[PDB]
C-alpha cells in the first residue's frame, strides 16, 4: 500500500513490456526511489506474492489485480471489494462498491497478462457501443488493464431459472434482441442460456460479449440460425414452449 | 517512415519521421485518410513490410478465403516456399493485434503438443503467417472416399483437446480443412473454453453434435460410438 511499494510494482510491470524476467537493476531505474531501498521493497512484494523471482523479477496474477484495483481506486470507482459472485467465459466476476457494481477480471513468446489487457478493452468497446445503441447490456463504468467495471444486474442467468410467469414474453424479448443486433449488422455467435440474465421484472440482459460475426460475412446465415435454434431449444426444453414465427435471415 | 509516424496532425508526423508532399502521395494510394489517420489498407502495408524485412513474406497473394474475423491470403518468401497470411479484421485496429497474438499463442502451443494445426511461422500487428495447407474446408466437400475415417479423426481431435483441458467452442465444417490424404486440420481457435469451466459439458456436447449433424446432412454417415464429457 506504500507509495514506494507501488512505484516498484509499477516498474516491474513497466520493464515487462520489453523483458520476460525484469532484472532488479532495471526496476531500480524506473522506480527512481531517490534514497534507494529498492531491493528491500522487492523482498516485501515477493513475500506478499505480488511478484515472483524466476536473473530477475516478474509480475504475479495477484500483483496484476492489485495494480488494476489501485488505479480504479485512484479514479474513485472501486473503494471496497466484496465476494466473487461468479465466473465468465474467461473471467472472474466479483462485486464492488464506490453504490454496488460488478468487477470482471479477465483471466487467460507473448505474455498472457497483456492479452488479458486487450480482452478487457474488447469487452468494454463492445459494451460501450451496444449500450449507446440502446441495447439491454450492463452500463460500462470504466476499465483498467484486465479489469472492467460495469452496472450490477439484479438477476440470475436464464439457465438457473426453472419456473417463469410467462415464457412467451421472455421468448419474444430474446428473439427481438437477435433481430435488433442483426439489423445493426451483428451476430452474437454464442447467444444462449448462460450469456443472458433474467432480472426481477423478467427482462433479458446480455452479459457475455464475445467476438461478434458481421451479417456481411459469407457464413452469417449459419451463425444467425444457430442463435435462433439455441433460444428455440432452451424454451422448448425448460418451459416446454413452442412458436411458429421465429426470426430468419429474411427479417434482417 | 512517414507511414510509421502516422487523427494525427501533419506537424506531428514531420517530427516523428524526421518532407511536405508525402502527404497526398499515400492519401491518393489510400494508405492514409483525413489531421490524418491510418487506413486498414495502410495497416496491411506496415505489417507486410515488417514481415518482408524479416525475410518471411516476399510476394503478394490471391485472397483464398475468409476466417471468422480475418482475411486469408496466399504468400511466398524469397525461396518460393508458399505460406498462408491471415490478416485480422475486427468488425479498434490495436484490438486486431490481440486476435493475431492470441491466435499465434494458441497455434504455437497446440502445434508443439502434436495437434493437427498449421505450423506458425511468424506474426506482426494483425498479420499471422502460417503453413499453407493443401486442402479445402470440410463445408466445400460433398463426397469423400471414407466418411468413417474422417469422422473418427474429428472426434479424436475433440477428445485430445479435452484431455489437455480445452474445448474449441466453434468446432465445425468451416474451421476444419480436409487435405489430399483426407486428414483434418484445425484452422481457427477464436475463444477456447477450459474443461474446468462450469458450463464446459454444454460447450463439449455442442462441438460433438456439430460433427454428427454435418456427417449426416452431407455423406449421410452415423456412428454409434461418439465422445461423452464424463471421459475428461
Curated annotation (Swiss-Prot), chain A:
Residues the record marks as active site: 190 (proton acceptor)
Domain Protein kinase: 81-234
Signal peptide, first to last residue: none
Domain of life per record: Eukaryota
Protein location: Cytoplasm
UniProt-annotated binding residues for ATP: 104
Post-translational modification comment from the UniProt entry: Autophosphorylated (in vitro).
Effect the entry attributes to changing residue 208 to A: Abolishes autophosphorylation; impairs release of pre-40S trans-acting factors and rRNA processing
Result when mutating residue 178 to T: In a renal clear cell carcinoma sample; somatic mutation
Family from the record: Belongs to the protein kinase superfamily. RIO-type Ser/Thr kinase family.
Functional description taken from the UniProt entry: Serine/threonine-protein kinase involved in the final steps of cytoplasmic maturation of the 40S ribosomal subunit. Involved in export of the 40S pre-ribosome particles (pre-40S) from the nucleus to the cytoplasm. Its kinase activity is required for the release of NOB1, PNO1 and LTV1 from the late pre-40S and the processing of 18S-E pre-rRNA to the mature 18S rRNA. Regulates the timing of the metaphase-anaphase transition during mitotic progression, and its phosphorylation, most likely by PLK1, regulates this function.
Assembly with partners or alone: Associated with late 40S pre-ribosomal particles. Interacts with PLK1 (via its N-terminus).
Stated name of the protein: Serine/threonine-protein kinase RIO2
Species the sequence originates in: Homo sapiens (Human)
UniProt lineage: Eukaryota, Metazoa, Chordata, Craniata, Vertebrata
Full-protein residues shown: 12 to 290 of 552
Amino acid at each position: 500500500m506504500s507509495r514506494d511499494d507501488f512505484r516498484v510494482l509499477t516498474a516491474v510491470e513497466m520493464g515487462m513490456k520489453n523483458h520476460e524476467i525484469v532484472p532488479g537493476s532495471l526496476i531500480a531505474s524506473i522506480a527512481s526511489l531517490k534514497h534507494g531501498g529498492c531491493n528491500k521493497v522487492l523482498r516485501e512484494l515477493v513475500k506478499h506474492k505480488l511478484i515472483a523471482w524466476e536473473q530477475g523479477y516478474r509480475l504475479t496474477n495477484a500483483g496484476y489485480d492489485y495494480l488494476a484495483l489501485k488505479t480504479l481506486s485512484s479514479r474513485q470507482v472501486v473503494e471496497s471489494v466484496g465476494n466473487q459472485m461468479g465466473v465468465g467465459k474467461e473471467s472472474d466476476i466479483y462485486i464492488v462498491a464506490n453504490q454496488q457494481f460488478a468487477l470482471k477480471l479477465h483471466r487467460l513468446n507473448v505474455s498472457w497478462l497483456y492479452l488479458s489487457r486487450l480482452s478487457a478493452m474488447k469487452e468494454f468497446a463492445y459494451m460501450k457501443a451496444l449500450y449507446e445503441r440502446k441495447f439491454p447490456v450492463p452500463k460500462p463504468i470504466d476499465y483498467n488493464r484486465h479489469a472492467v467495471v460495469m452496472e450490477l444486474i439484479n438477476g440470475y442467468p436464464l439457465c438457473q431459472i426453472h419456473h417463469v410467469e410467462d415464457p412467451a414474453s421472455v421468448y419474444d424479448e430474446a428473439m427481438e434482441l437477435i433481430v435488433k443486433l442483426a439489423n445493426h449488422g451483428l451476430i452474437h455467435g454464442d447467444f444462449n442460456e448462460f450469456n443472458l440474465i433474467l432480472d426481477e421484472s423478467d427482462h433479458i440482459t446480455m452479459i457475455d460479449f464475445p467476438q461478434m460475426v458481421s451479417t456481411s460475412h459469407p457464413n452469417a446465415e449459419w451463425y444467425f440460425d444457430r442463435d435462433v435454434k439455441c433460444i428455440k431449444d432452451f424454451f422448448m426444453k425448460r418451459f416446454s414452449y413452442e412458436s411458429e414465427l421465429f426470426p430468419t435471415f429474411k427479417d434482417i
